[PDB]
Symmetry: C2
Subunit: 664 residues, 2 copies
Amino acid sequence: ATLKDIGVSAGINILTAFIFFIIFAFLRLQPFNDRVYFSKWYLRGLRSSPASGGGFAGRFVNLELRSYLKFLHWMPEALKMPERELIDHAGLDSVVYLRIYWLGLKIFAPIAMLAWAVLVPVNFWAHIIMAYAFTIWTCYMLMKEYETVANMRLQFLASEGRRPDQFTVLVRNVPPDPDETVSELVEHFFLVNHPDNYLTHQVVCNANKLADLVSKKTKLQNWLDYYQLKYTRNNSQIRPITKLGCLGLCGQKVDAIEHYIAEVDKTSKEIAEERENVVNDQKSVMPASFVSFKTRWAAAVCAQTTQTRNPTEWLTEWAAEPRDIYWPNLAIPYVSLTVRRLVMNVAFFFLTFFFIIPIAFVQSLATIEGIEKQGLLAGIALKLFLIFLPAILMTMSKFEGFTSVSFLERRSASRYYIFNLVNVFLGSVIAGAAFEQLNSFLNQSPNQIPKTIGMAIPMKATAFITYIMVDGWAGVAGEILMLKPLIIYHLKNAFLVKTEKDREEAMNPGSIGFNTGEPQIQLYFLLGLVYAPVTPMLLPFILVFFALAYVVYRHQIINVYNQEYESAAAFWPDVHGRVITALIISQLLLMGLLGTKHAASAAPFLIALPVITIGFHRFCKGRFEPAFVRYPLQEAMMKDTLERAREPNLNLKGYLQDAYIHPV
Amino acid sequence: ATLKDIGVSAGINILTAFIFFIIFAFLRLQPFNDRVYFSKWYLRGLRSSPASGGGFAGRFVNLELRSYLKFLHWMPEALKMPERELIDHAGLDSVVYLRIYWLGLKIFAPIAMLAWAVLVPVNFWAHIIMAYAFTIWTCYMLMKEYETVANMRLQFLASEGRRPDQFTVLVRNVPPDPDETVSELVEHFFLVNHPDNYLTHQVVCNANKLADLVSKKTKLQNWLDYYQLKYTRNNSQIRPITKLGCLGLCGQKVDAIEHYIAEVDKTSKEIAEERENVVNDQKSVMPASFVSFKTRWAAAVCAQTTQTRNPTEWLTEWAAEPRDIYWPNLAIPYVSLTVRRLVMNVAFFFLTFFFIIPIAFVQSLATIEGIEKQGLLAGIALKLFLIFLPAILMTMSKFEGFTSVSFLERRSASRYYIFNLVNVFLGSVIAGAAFEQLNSFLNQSPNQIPKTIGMAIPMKATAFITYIMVDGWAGVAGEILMLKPLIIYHLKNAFLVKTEKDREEAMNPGSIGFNTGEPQIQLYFLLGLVYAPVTPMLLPFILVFFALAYVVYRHQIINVYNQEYESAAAFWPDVHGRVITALIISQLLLMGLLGTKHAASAAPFLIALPVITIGFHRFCKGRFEPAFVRYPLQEAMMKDTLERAREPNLNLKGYLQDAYIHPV
């Protein structure tokens, strides 16, 4: 646990990262791996077939050029593209996500210098002075970044080309009327309440079943497509037991190929059936619509205005890009939304507290099944749970009912933050023997709960240092290697490829993953902020994470990741608020570290710090936050007038009419 | 402190109230007192000169008819006018203020029955069950009243005649431009951002000096007007030392009459001067304007929409009625607003905590000056402070910068609530020896502050019982007597009357006084809710207050009080929230009363109660509150269309143009 010991593990992790980088150098040279290493370039059409032409040499024939810049040159090259160019290459979302890593450096580097020039030499009022300076600097940098990101969002929103969401609102909870259809209600309402600028509307329909049937058809057509064209005739008719799939030659359904062709045909028959009972029924039509307006100004008005005396009916909000719309959740009743949120809130309480016990349950189950038909339960335990955490949290957000992928990712990121506040930091080691602490809290005569818990849950430094070195050093290095997407496309272009040209593209690497990546940055913001006034040891390792992550993610944003939506940095208020939470928690923990005994000339200052931080947060929520939630009417009018001058005769009707039909 | 003792004081206070009612019976018979007893009727024009003709008999000649209904008949007569008729007679504000007393009965009567059928007989899980039922009932009644008051407000706003505020917004923080005047900036902005419906605007000017000069002129013209026309020629040239006024024949300024005529003339000369340097200067013009629109729908849009990328500039809010506008605060810079609020927040901390010490200071001062030139310091101490509390709190709200009398009254009512939470209830007796408790808190090694304070600050029952009987029984009875307004007009129609007809009207009794009356109701809501699950003794006395206050205030609303503004019950969210606070405090105190020792099958329920209450509050803030803050666009459009059909050719321009000029 000494500097020496920690430094040994540091060197090991630096080497692990370097090994990853070396493999990356080799794999990125392979012409057949370029599809999954330069995906963004192909998605942009700037690069051609994989290796600028594809299928060439330069692979294992020359391995990787023996040097130092083989596994290092990609770093300065990632830092070469200007930010403006990356805004048009990747998007504003990705550029401001990168700005969070730069913010971490802009905040922690100066405060690391301060903590290393005060604490370690002079080793108390120094702690409180440091705390103050740290919070002042953090807030100053947060305000400057709130301003820059807001100005970037506004510049982006103004220079953006026509988007259907700029003219549309999602009206929800349209009150049911026994004499009129949802469509008629909507049309009439917006023709009398927004007469001057109402253009068109698109009622939301529950086409979830039809969509799932179409998705099932495609899945089944591609299930045994590998087997269908393996050798045709009668191939390996595998039987993945119908309960979980995968498997293969395990159940009893041999039949034929292409997932037993008749099955694909019966799914097609059900698709036809559903199509009939979804277009001609008027019961699939949900109490919601997508109302478009002739001007962006009018849509802004509608989005930021109450329409009726019942503020829970005719709820109008800025619509999301048609590609950001999560259609399954647009068919969930509004009343249900609130109940689902509550159910998922308590399910999360359970997931963030009583989760080690179910993990131990499955661990014990795995020991039993391990004996039956070398093992040592490696890779399971909680590692697998941490890989599934983002997905579990995402399905929880989908249950809650968010109708935009952007918002779902933002909700999952907020949940992951709370998970990390509890299970990585305050409350990880306090969770002794499952709910033993909770049993004592239930049988506690007085209110000793905070006492017991707080006292023994502040966590340690050297242990956290190893976490940064494993998850934030070698972890971000593994990201550059893109192992799983490579494997996926390898076992797809060799398996179920059968494409006429380039239709079977499993090269898609998804996006940055705000629901996972941001929680990581925020956990290191938390760690670095809480420990800063106490120990200056966490800061150096946290800073290496920020620098490495900046470069690895910049590379991945320029070369691999493709944005699945464009929210124009709408998530920044969330980011800001989580660093504000980190700050407040830091000051609260310092109050505890320096409150017992101490002095009466310490508490007045350690109580002013949280207040100042909350006041700054409120100032920032009133100065910069509105830019991310409401479109200013002057900006909307400016865009409208300029567009109507450049294009005097645009038929917005056609463009906005079919924009919000369910993709099915 | 026994039932007997408390009942003796009860009888005394019942008799005091009856004595007040008896004097009221006599005084309301006097034909010369009718001006200040039936003021509303004269303000409405329904009644003529004082005693339906004025100056008659029926005074002391027959005294008061010896009976029982002399001092009792006014009660059923006050309960005779229907609520709808009172909405058009007095206003919605006054009708919903009366509804708070009825709400108190609707909440406390059923819960008094429950507490008297459970606690007293069976005398613990009964306390927690009572608490639950009490909160459920209170919330149910709160929700039902939120609904009724909201529907009443919407019905009122729809049936209201054209009001200038229905088409106007107060734009604040108009960004300074070196090339354009505030007027030009405003006009251009709203002609490009709200082109379709912008009508006119009225820039706010700092005419505070001119207004104060005009007010000074009138004050001086009426100062020694009594003396001017006492006997004319050369009358008693009194000298109120110029530092506080009043006095008379005390300073050195003898001069002449009418406050030394030359002074009135020099104030008139300064009025002329100021008029020049306020109309022709463009530096008096504040960065704010009153923008009117052709439709109420457009003003609603503007009020509930962000106008520019800087959400702190071009701030648009629904304008208040020109009569509700507090013009002095419309000339206070927006930046200053925030600082002033903070300064007044800490001044209030001082007023609600360290206030007994300044009272003791002045008390000790009065002992010294008492000897100099029978005394016993009667009526001073804190009684005088409680009469000045509403005024102090009002001047604090005026400092904060609220530009509407309605909002100033609402702010002062909120402050008075906090004062009462602390100094009437939790923290009154804990304030031992000024700041002795605070000195110990400053030198407290651990966090023993909550412990010490809470333990010894829950207050007692019998003592509170006497408070209800004095302030809520005899207090509301004294209100019916209207002593001070009577005296004022008596010493004005006999003093500085000199009116050609009926111009010197000091019969104006003001309004209900939301800034004072509501805090009282809320203090009894608090007391009755906190004590209910513990003791059922406070409830009966609290219920008598509600009943008596309902009848006395209904009488005063129908006969005396005249509304100075019409907010259409916009204060109800505040009322609701203060009863919600009472509920939460009640549950917190019950947790303390029943948490030490007790059981582990009591805490889970006593922690669910506050959560349920906050959840209900949030539901009510999302369902009913928006009706009080934002005008629904459908309602605005309905009013607009109906009005444009009844009156096809209205020139809203003329009506809305001169509506917002400073009354000077």
